[PDB]
């Protein structure tokens, strides 16, 4: 599969590599994707592989690392994430997510 | 003494069988090796509450002619919060050089505490106090000059992280 | 874990609900009722004569002991003894006594204890299908001296299980008794018992529910039945005075 790639590097790298373009094209940068499909297809593969060829850094959170068993120990933890992004900007985040299940 | 009195009521086959469970490995145990088997390093005595077994184990080791000592598992964790397991090893060394001898210790379900209920480094006492127990009883070699007894009401509440497989091998209910 | 998910998640108050273990529990809770008297009967075969024995307790003095009895002469050639509370014994006794009859009105002879344990047990099943009725908290024994089979004992429980034993007891104290005649049979390898007279076979069955029961018995604490061809009836008190004199 390679067509799938072309959408990633269209959203990820172009607003980072040289985004003067969008100011000519008169639209808004994008800010995320999501990727679905059965297991055993190679989706968590790709995010390991995207790291090699970024030039921008990388963050990873399997689900269930957020939870910390107290009331707000979790929602303090997400916020402790994003601030660690901005100072280290630019940055990418990768997430298996079921905290947002339900 | 080797001739001591034990004549309270209630129970006969128990005092009859512990005599089997515990006498022979102490008096002339040079046979358990050449026959082949390994004797039991330890024992457990479970049942319902309100039964008067503290005096029982106090008694039957006294008629047999064994040096008996007994300590609850409360003061070792009540008086001594974070200076406990020092007492354990001393309780054996003292017990060693006075070989042979029997142990008894009730409220044994207190060592669990958290039982690593969260794995935080605040319950090191409730964790290590199980550790030094196990490492020491493994150090006996089970020759036949030191044996151990434990007891509680809730063996289903027990900590089979150890004391189940081969340490407190023989489990014995009571009527 | 056994009944923990039972006592919490229903499964113990409706009859017609299975548990994921497969077990339904209501009928499995009926049997606790059978032992609510602390009573313990017995039954054995003969060459042609059958017997059943029961305690008959010594409560407060005001009773009239002629009527306290768990031995119900159903029809002729038939009889039964219960294990459980009295009221839930009658409704089984009476649903029968009007059932042997219509047979004899509709088929031309008297029922055996075979059918009478298959019929009444073909009903206690039904009442564990529908919600007509709480299953009767009993377990009841039958006796007879049949023409085609000889002596015969049968037994029935609130589910519907029925088998014709060779000898048996029941109540809170089966293990003690049952061993004190299971071992007896492997001695001799006779499904029945000797001592032709219905007299002499009683004293066999008394003494086995003395040594293995746990005490000594008078004439008043007992009540005893018997089955012989053409009849079923109850008895007098001298049969033990003509025991201990011999011993």
């Amino acid at each position: 599969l390679t067509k799938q790639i072309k959408e990633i590097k269209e959203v990820i790298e172009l607003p980072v590599k040289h985004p003067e373009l969008f100011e000519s094209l008169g639209i808004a940068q994008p800010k995320g994707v999501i990727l679905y499909g059965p297991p055993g297809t190679g989706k968590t593969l790709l995010a390991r592989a995207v790291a090699h060829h970024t030039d921008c850094k990388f963050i990873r959170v399997s689900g269930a690392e957020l939870v910390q068993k107290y009331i707000g120990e979790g929602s303090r933890m997400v916020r402790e994430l994003f601030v660690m992004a901005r100072e280290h900007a630019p940055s990418i985040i990768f997430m298996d997510e079921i905290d947002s299940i339900g | 003494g080797e001739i001591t009195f034990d004549g309270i009521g209630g129970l006969t086959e128990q005092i009859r069988e512990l005599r089997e469970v515990i006498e022979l490995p102490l008096k002339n145990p040079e046979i358990f090796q050449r026959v082949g088997i390994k004797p039991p390093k330890g024992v457990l005595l479970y049942g319902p509450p309100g039964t008067g077994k503290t005096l029982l184990a106090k008694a039957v080791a006294a008629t047999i002619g064994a040096n008996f000592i007994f300590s609850p598992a409360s003061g070792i964790v009540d008086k001594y919060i974070g200076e406990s397991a020092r007492i354990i090893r001393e309780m054996f060394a003292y017990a060693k050089e006075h070989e042979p001898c029997i142990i008894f210790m009730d409220e044994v379900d207190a060592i669990g505490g958290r039982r690593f209920s969260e794995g935080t480094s605040a319950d090191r006492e409730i964790q290590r106090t199980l550790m030094e127990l196990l490492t020491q009883m493994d150090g006996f070699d089970n020759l036949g000059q030191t044996k151990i007894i434990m007891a509680t009401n809730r063996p289903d509440t027990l900590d089979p992280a150890l004391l189940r497989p081969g340490r407190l091998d023989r489990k014995v209910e009571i009527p | 874990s056994g009944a923990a998910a039972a006592s919490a998640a229903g499964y113990d108050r409706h009859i017609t609900i299975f548990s994921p273990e497969g077990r339904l529990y209501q009928v499995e809770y009926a049997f606790k009722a059978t032992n609510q008297t602390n009573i313990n009967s017995l039954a054995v075969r003969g060459k042609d004569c059958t017997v059943v024995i029961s305690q008959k307790k010594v409560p407060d003095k005001l009773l009239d002991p002629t009527t306290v009895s768990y031995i119900f002469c159903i029809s002729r050639t038939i009889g039964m003894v219960v294990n459980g509370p009295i009221p839930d014994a009658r409704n089984a006794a009476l649903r029968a006594k009007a059932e042997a009859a219509e047979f004899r009105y509709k088929y031309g002879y008297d029922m055996p204890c075979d059918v009478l344990a298959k019929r009444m047990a073909n009903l206690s099943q039904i009442y564990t299908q529908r919600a007509y009725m709480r299953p009767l908290g009993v377990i009841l024994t039958f006796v007879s001296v049949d023409e085609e089979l000889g002596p015969s004992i049968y037994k029935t429980d609130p589910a519907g299980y029925y088998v014709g034993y060779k000898a048996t007891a029941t109540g809170p104290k089966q293990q003690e008794i049952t061993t004190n005649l299971e071992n007896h049979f492997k001695k001799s390898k006779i499904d029945h018992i000797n001592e032709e007279s219905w007299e002499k076979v009683v004293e066999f069955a008394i003494t086995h529910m003395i040594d293995a029961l746990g005490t000594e018995f008078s004439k008043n604490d007992l009540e005893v039945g018997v089955a012989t061809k053409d009849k079923f009836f109850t008895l007098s008190a001298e049969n033990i005075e003509e025991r201990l004199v011999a011993i």
Binding site: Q4, E7, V11, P30, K31, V33, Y36, G37, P38, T41 | - | -
Partner: protein, 101 residues
């Protein structure tokens, strides 16, 4: 799932047969790959309904050679691999008979 948080999304389906052929060449780049192979066929003998079950196959094939102490393989050492991931998935949990049409 709104735009403003995830502006597009992706479907990763399981592959075609001609699709899978390239998945094996990459997993087999370090295997020895004796000559007379048509691994455009092995895909067709068993559609790997995943895209990673094959990663066990190309592994599983070499495992035979290990047992024999051979280093290399041929087509045969693949043609039995399909016997394990596919058939033993149908002979894994299809073992009821009670069912309802």
């Amino acid at each position: 799932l709104r735009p403003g948080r995830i502006d597009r999304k992706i479907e990763f389906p399981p592959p075609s047969v001609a699709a899978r052929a390239e998945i094996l060449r990459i997993h087999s780049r370090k295997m020895n790959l004796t000559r007379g192979i048509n691994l455009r066929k092995v895909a067709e003998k068993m559609n790997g309904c995943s895209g990673a079950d094959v990663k066990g196959v190309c592994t599983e094939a070499g495992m035979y050679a290990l047992r024999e102490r051979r280093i290399h393989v041929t087509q045969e050492d693949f043609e039995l691999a399909v016997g394990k991931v596919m058939n033993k998935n149908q002979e894994t949990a299809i073992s009821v008979a009670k069912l309802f049409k």
